[PDB]
Structure 1
């Protein structure tokens, strides 16, 4: 499996890579369209990529942490693998984020809000310590962050 599938890694990684960078935004109806449309272009119909990247064990753990079971939540969850550009969450239902932090929790981290007395301060601390960081009420992109 390693032999014949790592030979299919290149296309495996193509597909996978593409999803994250582009379909981070779209809804599952639109996403699935492009999944199939590019999968068929590859000719690699099977080995659907959600099970590929994150194994059985991982999925259950994130359930365990109080992630929504929803597949979109699975999809979004795997987008946290993106680290090069910062991921931005729309989370009207806090749980997605809550999970994120919670899995984060017994690990170095911090949390603040857009409009906050301590905002600039905290930020500076976070960077020097390299404490991983989250922010709550991002009305838009802060110029400061560019």
Structure 2
């Protein structure tokens, strides 16, 4: 569990040589030089079902799709070619979903509906970290009796418990400051 947590909470950003070197150093640090983790954390049937949809079959793509098990924070998809995003909005068909663009006319209205109704939300063309989305990405929940409300600009909006937010990106740089990167975990689809 230490190795499986350390991989998720650190190494979804580094290139794969740093993944190999750090996993080998940690694995020799524990002393169990066998005992891989992609079979420890997922089994064969889920892998072939993920492959049945359009997930790329590399080690990098499958480990990146394993890291978005994380729900403590928001995942951040650095993704030059849109296959992984097509896969994620394929196998998130079952729950409620809306997908919106960044430079879109109805952004804040649809954002209000997605916070209220309890949707699972995917954002397409992010150029960085929006100024609006800071208390929602953090935890800012003032209570009104049994429920909780969260600040979006000027409105006061009920934070539905079924709120799940993902967002895509088309260029590895732009844009993170060192303040909106300690709360957002970053995943880089890369051709290796």
Tell me the TM-score normalized by structure 2: 0.68
| Residue 110 of structure 2 corresponds to residue 126 of structure 1 | no
The 2-side partners of 1:114 and 1:66 are apart by 24
4+ long deviations beyond 3 Å: none
Q: Deviations over 1:70-98 (max 9, x none)?
A: 11100100011111110000111101110
Q: Deviations over 1:36-71 (max 9, x none)?
A: 101110112222001111110110000001101111
The 1-side partners of 2:39 and 2:63 are apart by 11
Moved more, 17-26 or 103-112: 103-112
SS state at 1:75 partner = helix
SS state at 1:89 partner = strand
Tell me the TM-score normalized by structure 1: 0.89
* Correspondence for 1:115 among 103, 107, 112: 103
Instruction: Report which of the two has the higher share of helix.
Output: 1
The equivalent residue for 1:25 is: 13
RMSD, aligned α-carbons: 0.9
- CA drift at 1:107: 2.4
The 2-side partners of 1:58 and 1:52 are apart by 13
Which structure 1 segments of 5+ residues have no match?
1-12
Q: Deviations over 1:78-135 (max 9, x none)?
A: 0111111100001111011100110001321110111111110111111111111100
Instruction: Report which of the two has the higher share of strand.
Output: 2
